[PDB]
Design a binder for this molecule. Structure first.
Ligand SMILES: CCCCCCCCCCCCCCCCCC(=O)OC[C@H](COP(=O)([O-])OCC(O)COP(=O)([O-])OC[C@@H](COC(=O)CCCCCCCCCCCCCCCCC)OC(=O)CCCCCCCCCCCCCCCCC)OC(=O)CCCCCCCCCCCCCCCCC
Ligand SMILES: CCCCCCCCCCCCCCCCCC(=O)OC[C@H](COP(=O)([O-])OCC(O)COP(=O)([O-])OC[C@@H](COC(=O)CCCCCCCCCCCCCCCCC)OC(=O)CCCCCCCCCCCCCCCCC)OC(=O)CCCCCCCCCCCCCCCCC
Ligand SMILES: CCCCCCCCCCCCCCCCCC(=O)OC[C@H](COP(=O)([O-])OCC(O)COP(=O)([O-])OC[C@@H](COC(=O)CCCCCCCCCCCCCCCCC)OC(=O)CCCCCCCCCCCCCCCCC)OC(=O)CCCCCCCCCCCCCCCCC
Ligand SMILES: CCCCCCCCCCCCCCCCCC(=O)OC[C@H](COP(=O)([O-])OCC(O)COP(=O)([O-])OC[C@@H](COC(=O)CCCCCCCCCCCCCCCCC)OC(=O)CCCCCCCCCCCCCCCCC)OC(=O)CCCCCCCCCCCCCCCCC
Ligand SMILES: CCCCCCCCCCCCCCCCCC(=O)OC[C@H](COP(=O)([O-])OCC(O)COP(=O)([O-])OC[C@@H](COC(=O)CCCCCCCCCCCCCCCCC)OC(=O)CCCCCCCCCCCCCCCCC)OC(=O)CCCCCCCCCCCCCCCCC
Ligand SMILES: CCCCCCCCCCCCCCCCCC(=O)OC[C@H](COP(=O)([O-])OCC[N+](C)(C)C)OC(=O)CCCCCCCCCCCCCCCCC
Ligand SMILES: CCCCCCCCCCCCCCCCCC(=O)OC[C@H](COP(=O)([O-])OCC[N+](C)(C)C)OC(=O)CCCCCCCCCCCCCCCCC
Ligand code: FES
Ligand code: FES
Lengths: 125, 53, 383, 100, 220, 89, 53, 383
């Protein structure tokens, strides 16, 4: 495992994007948490051991909290303030939309839904 | 922070435990037969409404 | 200062894995379990404290012989004038088995004299209902009547009268002072008593101990059970009474033994004292006497970590590390696991989670290779 | 102000401190739960929480589990093992990857 | 004290692992909540360990019955010597279950079983209630036993959403047809069926107002 | 006559190689009945120096009806009390 | 009893006060500048509900 | 061990009967109240910690001269890059009042950048309402703006740039980290804040101290008030903030000063450090630095009973007893009262209750005559 980089975290390998928005998790004071870096953990944001079974240099981030409460744990695994979210998921989504194939996929889904919208609009004729 | 956080009370407790003559002291009886044991004050009032166990 | 030493402890050998023929201790000791000797060097006094269940002819005649041999300056007996009169009127009885036939007659010693005011009548109703409930929970047989004085105290009083020795009566278990204390105590009700009595055995250990004690009593009988009564068993019974009724138990045990200690220590006529008391009061009286006299047995301090073989643990860890390094170097590989011996608490055998002792902060951390074969030289020695 | 140690495996690196902490927490929990049985009984490393015949008390074991988990900030897997003695408690604490 | 209903904290995280659980813990007092949690855990683990002891005894004494039940070998071979009564696992009971890989199959099976139970209750058992002529209230009893079977919602419900398949003009024609068909007063199915005296929700072309007719039966 | 597999297999002197010297095979020495473990749960955990076996005994199997009835009396009394309360309510 | 009753805790407290180096010890700060003062454990939880003063 | 020494103390001379011209302290000290020097012998480091209210040209130029003279190896300033940019753009200003004319422009440094998610919007609403309420409770004027960095920090940064010295920015009072901590803290509401702020002054002492501080501020002005700011006044303000909002006070003061100490102790480039910080964070940083360095000023243990004149009390009692005995012997009578000097707390002057020191257990008690003239001989000496 690796310690908590104070806003200077760069994953060793490219992690799996577990999600596109963070988890609002209640952390206990003084309890050690093993945030998942690879992104394929089956136990949520916390390490499940699948980093040992997947080919990746991303290791779990072991950290502690001095005051219990709600924290936004990163799920995209690209936050520079890992394990804490820093709105990097929004930039990840924006880059996905900027990419040629990502733009096509997003707008294809959008137009597929707009098909339902148009059917509802024109239901009476 | 990068270092795992521990309370100052926890650090002091660890430092005390590092001593070779450490023993629990918040006990009403000298179970460990320590010559320097001092009977702690009993947290019971006149009503004695918390003696049931 | 307060000499807060262990008292009313019933747990035997908590550091031994007892079982089968390896018992925790021997509860059978008819003489030592109920004979205690205490000394007061400052006043040059000796006390022979006897804990009697009033249901053993063996102990009765042993106490008679002890009194005859010692010729005490004074005798204290936990009984009352009414019971003494009844016993002295009873004549030609030498065995506790025969004496037990008079238990109902001797039960009249519990005069419990009170008026019939409104408050006293309500108290009488509540107290008698609670006494019935507590006797139900006791479930003692006719042979075993610890709170009814009998042959032992009768012999003690008769021998004292024969030898012209002062006799001091301490009263029955429930005498006028104890009854007044119970009346002062308001927490007494048959329904709550039943609830707490059937809710007291909250642990399997308590249930098993209760079953063991009462099955032993039933199988062995009153006299044999009295003979085999032990200090740990008496402490367990005291704690069981505590659980059944802490408020009543306080008055009936702690305050009663404090009063008995006061009587035996502050207002004892002679230097040699022979005290006969209910057995469950012996621990408290003994503790008070020892604390007052500053004559407690010197006990060596016990270190809570003194029984841990830290050297053995560290040596095992070092040996396992050396073996892992040697095997890894021989095989030109690394250890599969860092567990000295496989255990199934952690599901490392069939899950992705592993147990590897490799932790470092940065690329220039000297402890980078700790736990790996690269930490040992060609001679299999740490670097 | 005392800065906490940078290294992680302090509990494993200091077996004696972990054992002392386990003794303290177990003693406190036992005295709170069943005072009549453990008030006068010292708690040492070789102490066991079974009856004279070897049978275990699940209530006492679970109380010990709760005390240990609260102290060390971990989660004990009750279904996998039962703490019947300080030796078992020490084994579980050392086995746990991240106790503090 | 504060407007932090959804952010209330707890001293120990296990005393309520959700926002609503933490709110309840705050309301009830954390001491009582912790005591209740510990007591519940004690009960559950007492039951679990008693069951485990029973399963271990079963495995050691009667290995065949343990294998039939699907219990794993309860002995541990960490010492290295394999046990003398090990067996292959029979996991059909625990795999063909709503909680396992056969969850969908068992959901379909449960649905079919509930439907068959309802069919039995409506059609099979009542058939045996009456098998001979009855002197008193024969017709009443026959209709009592027949009502539960002839008025099942499967073939009665649906008219309330008839517009899903009936177009406005088709809806009006089918309304008049259904009124004619169910005109018979002695019809519990008609009683339980949704009324035809209503207008198409989308658009009505024939009936302007409900109940304003020239004939109490014909909708027009 | 053994209870533990490790003790049974640590030092075997009645193995076929040794028995073949005498060429006598008693029926009472069957491996089927040679060893049999106890009915109580026993599991290994890592000790200070080596694996140690811990036994998990939960309940006894020799209780009798008198004890069970004595433990059950409060349940019956509570049933009666609740029923009487309902009747009087 | 004819003698005025005082609890054993009270008697022990009086005996300790008879000492010439006595000072209150249930304080969160070393107000008396005693070299042997030990910081008592803080009775505050994670929620910190009781901190308000 | 934990160095539990006094911190955030504002009570001056609690053992003196102050009043009129006999004051308890001197709050006015322009240089000592804000300049602190700390040393770490182990690392051979020196720290010049300055507590600035950002509203004193005198202190600003004093800090500028101190930086020029010392030539620190590094400078730490509690500000941010946006404020530094605004200040450097603002040129040709040498007066604190002139800079205060830009206070609104400098307030733009509180970027408090956050997204507009639903949770963040609810936060923003609650936080800004609470900020309005707490500013209302502060009731500070434009002249005194302790949380808006100004001329002193501007001069410090400019001199550091001129001398080519590293500059470390610690952020405003409410920076990104502080805002994140506040967001984590849920206990924040304008209504509860108003209730607690108007219920905080629960004692006449607190009310009078608040009135005194704010009347002094109003009368003297921002600059004079900053110059006269004292350690005790700063501690009182910290405690007042604690009473207003302890949950927010924790984050604003304790955590912020702990982080500042971390920055100044663990990640300081050079040996000589010049730190400029809000004054109310100086006590905590100084306490942490002294505790870490083991360089607390050696204090002498104070006996809680060392200031009691037990000898004088006993001598007065003895003198009064001797005088009473002498007067009684002269008059052939006994004392009317045993009170050394009459006082009306006990109504002995006009009620039956008396004050007589005559107590004994029995007729043979040697203390029978204690307190009476019979205990003294004809020479007026005890027997
Ligand atoms: C007397 C009473 C009788 C009652 C009778 C019954 C009443 C009716 C039945 C109610 C059924 C409730 C179902 C929900 C169960 C929630 C379980 C729970 O509480 O677990 C605790 C769980 C974890 O607890 P914890 O560990 O303490 O963590 C707390 C943290 O704060 C955790 O915070 P966090 O941020 O980490 O995560 C929270 C949240 C954070 O993320 C989200 O917010 C998820 C959704 C947005 C994600 C994307 C954001 C980016 C922008 C999206 C833009 C498009 C949005 C619109 C989409 C198109 C339009 C619909 O993430 C999620 O929950 C992910 C869910 C994603 C799928 C949601 C899709 C819903 C579709 C249906 C919409 C219907 C709208 C109706 C009209 C509404 C207006 C009138 O916390 C929560 O779930 C929090 C929310 C609790 C909601 C309570 C129930 C409210 C009512 C919901 C009704 C739903 C619609 C109707 C359903 C059909 C039956 C009626
Ligand atoms: C009204 C019309 C009739 C019907 C209603 C009756 C009244 C309502 C009754 C309601 C039921 C609940 C009663 C609660 C109080 C219970 C007190 C209690 O148990 O303490 C007993 C109390 C405790 O004594 P102890 O501890 O056993 O010691 C006795 C030794 O001799 C040691 O004694 P010693 O020689 O050392 O000297 C002490 C002794 C000295 O006493 C003597 O021996 C004196 C002998 C006679 C010469 C002095 C006569 C002076 C009496 C003047 C009465 C003025 C009229 C007041 C009318 C008030 C009601 C309208 O005094 C005491 O110990 C205290 C005696 C207190 C009176 C006991 C009778 C209580 C019931 C009568 C009503 C008063 C309670 C409040 C009622 C209102 C609120 C509900 O005394 C007794 O044992 C009394 C024994 C005699 C029982 C019968 C009472 C007299 C008969 C008339 C009343 C019943 C009606 C009969 C005719 C109609 C058919 C039913
Ligand atoms: C008749 C029609 C009724 C329609 C309405 C619906 C049905 C009835 C609802 C009845 C509701 C009763 C009151 C409940 C709230 C009690 C107090 C409380 O704690 O909430 C306040 C709220 C609690 O904040 P917090 O819990 O600290 O926030 C989370 C932490 O920061 C920690 O942050 P974190 O990141 O750790 O997150 C923790 C997480 C962990 O927990 C979770 O996972 C939470 C999951 C559940 C979320 C809530 C689901 C919605 C159902 C609950 C009820 C709210 C419905 C809102 C939408 C209604 C749409 C029609 O929870 C959250 O994320 C919480 C986010 C939700 C914030 C609460 C929003 C509602 C505020 C209350 C006003 C609602 C008014 C509705 C209209 C009433 C018309 C009569 O604090 C405020 O914002 C204070 C001000 C509230 C508004 C009043 C002041 C307005 C300005 C002044 C105007 C002049 C006065 C006018 C008269 C008064 C008008 C009201
Ligand atoms: C018609 C209605 C009215 C009339 C009703 C009848 C008449 C009235 C009276 C009825 C009650 C009589 C009670 C008598 C006294 C109690 C018993 C006693 O003293 O006996 C002495 C006897 C000796 O005990 P011990 O050794 O002295 O100490 C026991 C220890 O304490 C440790 O033991 P423990 O205390 O922890 O006891 C364990 C118990 C613990 O129970 C608890 O949950 C905790 C205790 C209750 C806590 C409180 C509950 C809630 C209270 C109310 C709360 C609500 C709020 C109230 C608020 C109030 C204020 C407003 O949990 C169990 O029941 C475990 C079940 C056994 C394992 C299940 C195995 C299933 C799979 C099969 C495996 C084997 C297959 C073999 C081969 C065949 C198949 C192929 O007690 C036992 O035997 C205890 C163990 C019992 C379980 C094992 C034996 C059962 C059979 C096992 C073989 C497989 C079949 C399993 C069938 C069950 C499946 C679920
Ligand atoms: C317009 C559309 C709607 C609104 C849109 C949003 C708002 C837009 C406008 C505002 C935009 C800016 C927002 C704020 C940005 C930040 C500003 C800033 O830097 O302020 C922070 C400020 C810095 O100032 P400073 O350095 O103290 O210098 C003081 C000077 O006086 C210099 O003071 P200053 O000039 O820096 O003043 C700061 C002030 C600047 O902002 C303002 O002045 C506010 C401007 C907008 C509102 C104007 C209202 C005017 C009202 C009168 C006019 C008629 C109204 C009629 C209404 C009728 C209908 C009701 O900040 C605020 O108060 C911001 C509040 C924003 C929310 C506004 C809405 C509030 C609604 C409240 C409703 C009522 C309560 C709830 C309901 C009750 C009834 C049920 O304080 C802090 O940095 C606080 C730090 C945290 C710890 C404080 C501890 C205090 C206690 C200890 C004291 C002793 C310390 C130790 C000893 C001494 C040192 C060693
Ligand atoms: C009488 C005669 C009347 C004649 C009237 C004729 C009117 C015709 C109006 C045409 C308007 C078209 C606007 C296109 C804007 C594109 C902007 C752009 O480059 O994107 C940058 C921005 C920024 O995106 P970005 O930079 O994050 O990533 C995309 C970047 N590229 C494309 C280079 C990879 O794009 C967006 O954010 C989305 C903009 C809108 C995209 C709309 C896509 C429509 C696809 C239609 C598919 C076919 C069906 C069409 C009919 C049905 C539609 C519902
Ligand atoms: C644990 C959560 C529990 C949730 C509560 C509901 C489930 C309870 C347990 C299962 C039984 C459910 C029976 C519901 C119907 C009872 C009445 C009945 O049969 O008649 C009404 C109707 C029959 O109505 P009818 O046509 O006879 O109408 C009677 C009235 N007259 C005569 C006037 C018309 O039942 C059906 O139509 C049954 C159809 C078969 C499928 C039923 C599915 C029920 C819903 C899904 C249940 C899933 C349970 C999963 C459990 C395991 C996982 C958690
Ligand atoms: S880091 Fe993703 S599983 Fe360990
Ligand atoms: S999820 Fe918000 S930054 Fe990764």
């Amino acid at each position: 495992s690796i310690p908590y980089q104070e806003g200077k975290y760069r994953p060793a390998s490219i992690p799996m994007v577990a999600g596109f928005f963070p988890y609002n998790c209640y952390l206990q004071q003084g309890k050690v948490y093993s945030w998942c870096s690879c992104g394929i953990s089956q136990s949520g944001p916390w390490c499940d051991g699948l980093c040992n079974s997947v080919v990746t240099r991303c290791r779990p981030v072991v950290f502690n909290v001095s005051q219990s409460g709600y924290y936004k744990i990163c799920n995209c695994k690209f936050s520079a303030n890992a394990p804490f979210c820093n709105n990097t998921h929004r930039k990840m989504v924006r880059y996905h939309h900027q990419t040629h194939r990502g733009f096509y996929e997003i707008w294809g889904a959008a137009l597929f839904v707009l098909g339902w919208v148009y059917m509802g609009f024109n239901y009476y004729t | 922070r990068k270092e795992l956080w521990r309370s100052q009370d926890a650090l002091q407790e660890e430092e005390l435990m590092v001593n070779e003559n450490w023993y629990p002291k918040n006990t009403q009886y000298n179970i460990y037969n320590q010559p320097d044991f001092i009977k702690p004050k009993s947290g019971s009032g006149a009503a004695a409404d918390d003696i049931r166990i | 200062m307060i000499s807060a030493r262990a008292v009313h402890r019933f747990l035997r050998n908590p550091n031994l894995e007892t079982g089968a023929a390896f018992r925790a201790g021997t509860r059978f000791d008819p003489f030592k379990n109920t004979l205690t000797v205490l000394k007061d060097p400052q006043n040059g006094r000796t006390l022979y404290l006897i804990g009697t269940t009033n249901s053993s002819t063996l102990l009765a005649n042993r106490t008679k012989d002890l009194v005859q041999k010692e010729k005490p300056d004074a005798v204290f007996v936990q009984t009352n004038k009414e019971w003494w009169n009844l016993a002295k009127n009873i004549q030609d009885v030498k065995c506790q088995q025969e004496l037990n036939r008079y238990n109902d007659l001797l039960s009249q010693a519990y005069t419990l004299s009170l008026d019939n005011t409104i408050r006293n009548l309500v108290f009488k109703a509540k107290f008698y209902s609670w006494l019935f409930v507590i006797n139900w929970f006791k479930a003692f047989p006719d042979d075993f009547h610890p709170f009814i004085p009998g042959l032992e105290m009768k012999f003690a009083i008769e021998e004292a009268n024969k030898q012209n020795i002062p006799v001091v009566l301490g009263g029955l278990e429930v005498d006028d002072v104890t009854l007044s204390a119970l009346k002062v105590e308001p927490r007494l009700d048959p329904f709550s008593q039943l609830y707490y009595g059937y809710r007291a055995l909250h642990n399997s250990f308590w249930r098993r101990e209760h079953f063991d004690n009462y099955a032993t009593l039933d199988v062995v009988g009153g006299e044999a059970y009295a003979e085999s009564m032990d200090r740990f068993r008496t402490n367990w019974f005291v704690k069981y009474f505590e659980k059944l009724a802490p408020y009543q138990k306080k008055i009936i045990v702690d305050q009663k033994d404090l009063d008995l200690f006061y009587a035996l220590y502050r207002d004892t006529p002679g230097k040699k004292i022979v005290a006969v008391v209910n057995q469950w009061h012996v621990p408290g009286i003994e503790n008070h006497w020892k604390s007052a006299t500053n004559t407690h047995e010197p006990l060596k301090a016990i270190n809570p970590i003194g029984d841990m073989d830290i050297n053995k643990y560290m040596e095992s860890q070092l040996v396992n590390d050396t073996l892992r390094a040697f095997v890894s170097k021989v095989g030109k590989t690394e250890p599969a696991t860092w567990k000295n011996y496989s255990t199934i608490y952690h599901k490392d055998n069939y899950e992705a989670e592993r147990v590897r002792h490799v932790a470092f902060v940065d690329h220039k951390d000297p402890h980078m290779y700790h736990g790996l074969p690269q930490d040992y030289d060609d001679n299999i020695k740490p670097k | 102000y005392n800065f906490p140690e940078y290294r992680t495996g302090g509990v494993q690196a200091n077996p004696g401190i972990t054992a002392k902490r386990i003794i303290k927490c177990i003693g406190e929990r036992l005295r709170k739960y069943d005072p009549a049985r453990w008030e006068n009984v010292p708690i040492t490393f070789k102490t066991h929480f079974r009856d004279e015949n070897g049978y275990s008390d699940v209530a006492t074991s679970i109380q010990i589990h709760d005390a240990l988990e609260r102290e060390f900030g971990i989660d004990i897997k009750d279904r996998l093992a039962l703490v019947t003695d300080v030796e078992t408690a020490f084994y579980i604490v050392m086995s746990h990857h991240d106790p503090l | 004290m504060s407007l932090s209903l959804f952010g209330v904290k707890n001293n120990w995280h296990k005393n309520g692992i959700w926002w609503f659980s933490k709110i309840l813990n705050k309301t009830v007092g954390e001491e009582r909540y912790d005591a209740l949690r510990v007591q519940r855990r004690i009960w559950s683990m007492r039951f679990y360990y008693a069951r485990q002891q029973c399963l271990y005894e079963l495995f050691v004494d009667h290995p065949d019955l343990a294998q039939w039940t699907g219990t794993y070998p309860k002995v541990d071979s960490s010492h290295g010597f394999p046990f003398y009564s090990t067996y292959e696992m029979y996991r059909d009971f625990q795999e063909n279950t709503l909680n396992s890989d056969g969850s969908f199959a068992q959901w379909i099976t449960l649905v079919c079983g509930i439907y068959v139970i309802h069919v039995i209750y409506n059609y099979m058992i009542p058939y045996y209630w009456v098998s001979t002529p009855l002197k008193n209230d024969e017709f009443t009893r026959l209709r009592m036993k027949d009502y539960i079977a002839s008025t099942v919602l499967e073939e009665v419900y649906g008219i309330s959403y008839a517009e899903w398949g009936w177009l406005p003009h088709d809806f009006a024609y089918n309304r008049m047809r259904g009124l004619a068909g169910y005109m018979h007063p002695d019809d519990p199915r008609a009683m339980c069926t949704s009324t035809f005296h209503r207008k198409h929700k989308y658009i009505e072309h024939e009936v302007e107002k409900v109940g304003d007719y020239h004939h109490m039966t014909y909708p027009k | 006559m053994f209870r533990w597999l490790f003790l049974y297999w640590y030092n075997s002197t009645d193995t076929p190689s040794a028995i073949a010297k005498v060429n006598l095979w008693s029926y009472i020495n069957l491996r089927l009945f040679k060893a049999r473990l106890s009915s109580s749960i026993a599991y290994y955990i890592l000790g200070l120096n080596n694996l140690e076996l811990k036994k998990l005994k939960i309940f006894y199997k020799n209780t009798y009806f008198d004890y069970i009835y004595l433990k059950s009396i409060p349940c019956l009394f509570l049933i009666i009390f609740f029923t009487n309360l309902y009747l009087f309510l």
